[PDB]
């Protein structure tokens, strides 16, 4: 998570990129309370439970949008940017993060690395990248790959200048996705741990082995792959 949130160059909305991120150990604490994110919000999953609900597979996307337009990255509304470039299925189960950033992105006098579609024939089916710029065709004289009357170039540009107001600053946005499926999950929350006391009746928990009793040191010798022992009648009488 640390590098995506700190990647130096984010792509523009139309060319948003993914990461088939899996088989790892998330930790949303600092991500939640980094005290810098102007817009943290999400759906489907509460902002606090998400510390531990283990996930099947998670996808991370990122782009850069105009400032005020940020709201349009949410299910069930419209806006030129959410209309043609990126929209979220109404059964969305992830989280959306946005924070102001012109101190990194607004080259003074004007940034021109960030472009977004304006005209397309069809509204955009959720979760697709449509990179190929197409000249818009309107009424008579439809135009393809040419510039003239009745022909409109689709990729406009952001003029991200620091002299702009808050409403037009650039925003680096990153959006997550979570889902529940059949095969056993692969990305769980960080697991709280603690010291171990001996010779007292305690409630222990080793990895999921749960019980209560008094723990002493032993004279057994497991096999390197063996994680706990049990006796006849199948009660746990040792642990690693």
């Amino acid at each position, epitope marked *: 998570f640390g590098e995506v949130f700190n990647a*130096t*160059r984010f*792509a*523009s909305v139309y*060319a948003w990129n993914r990461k088939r991120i899996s088989n790892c150990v998330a930790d949303y604490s600092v991500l939640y309370n980094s005290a810098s994110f102007s817009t943290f919000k999400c759906y489907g999953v509460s902002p606090t439970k998400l510390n531990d609900l283990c996930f099947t597979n998670v996808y991370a996307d990122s782009f850069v949008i105009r400032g005020d337009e940020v709201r349009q990255i949410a299910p069930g509304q419209t806006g030129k940017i959410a209309d043609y470039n990126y929209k979220l299925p109404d059964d969305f189960t992830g989280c959306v993060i946005a924070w102001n950033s012109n*101190n*990194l992105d607004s*080259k*003074v*006098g*004007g940034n*021109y*690395n960030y*472009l977004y579609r304006l005209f397309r024939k069809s509204n955009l089916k959720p979760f697709e990248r449509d990179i190929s*710029t197409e000249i818009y065709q309107a009424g008579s004289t439809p135009c393809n790959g040419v*510039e003239g009357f009745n022909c409109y*170039f689709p*990729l406009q*540009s952001y003029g991200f200048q620091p002299t702009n107001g808050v409403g037009y600053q650039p925003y680096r946005v990153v959006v997550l996705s979570f889902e529940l499926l059949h095969a056993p999950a692969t990305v769980c929350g960080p697991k709280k741990s603690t010291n171990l006391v001996k010779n007292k009746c305690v409630n222990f928990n080793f990895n999921g082995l749960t019980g209560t009793g008094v723990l002493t040191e032993s004279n057994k010798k497991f096999l390197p792959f063996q994680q706990f022992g049990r006796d006849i009648a199948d009660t746990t009488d040792a642990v690693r």
Partner: antibody
Amino acid sequence: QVQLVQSGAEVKKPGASVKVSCKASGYTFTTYAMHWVRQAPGQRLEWMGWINAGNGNTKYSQKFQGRVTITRDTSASTAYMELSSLRSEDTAVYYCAGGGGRRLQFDYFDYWGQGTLVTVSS
Amino acid sequence: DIQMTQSPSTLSASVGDRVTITCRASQSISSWLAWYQQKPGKAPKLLIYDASSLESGVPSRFSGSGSGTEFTLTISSLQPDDFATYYCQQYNGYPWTFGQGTKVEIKR
């Protein structure tokens, strides 16, 4: 491998105008970025401006404002430069640069033309 | 406008050695920079962009660093193909400028 080539040597006179041009050869034209820069001999390089080989955009410098112009021809896939009101200083070597490829724009010159020599004399 | 001056000026070396270059900026730069190699009588070749990244097709020796204002290039072993000047480009703001020139030599 993308390569850029362009015109040969020129010699002009004060007050005139000159037109240098470089032809492109790139695997795709994904809003290509022909992007001009010049060098007085034994001096600091100096940056001209960038044409948006995608469509038409023409951001220029400020020391050179109001007297230099840049265009391009789509079919020939070349870039056109134009300067007027020349004077003995602009004696230099002129360069084509650009050619991002992966993303659509940068501001760093990763494909350089082999150089064009311009002499302003009387 | 952004000023770019390199304190290194000319330098000295010998084959199989390491060198360092400093590029200072009059103002703050958010790690926007690139390093160009220019042999005499040729066209510039790019080496480093965004002050860190190593662009493809170059020897692995070259390496960038630095952030903020003071920026640094460094090569481990000095090969013959290293014998030319080196420039730093800022691209924090508008009109994009260049350095002064930092030219290596062959000590004897």
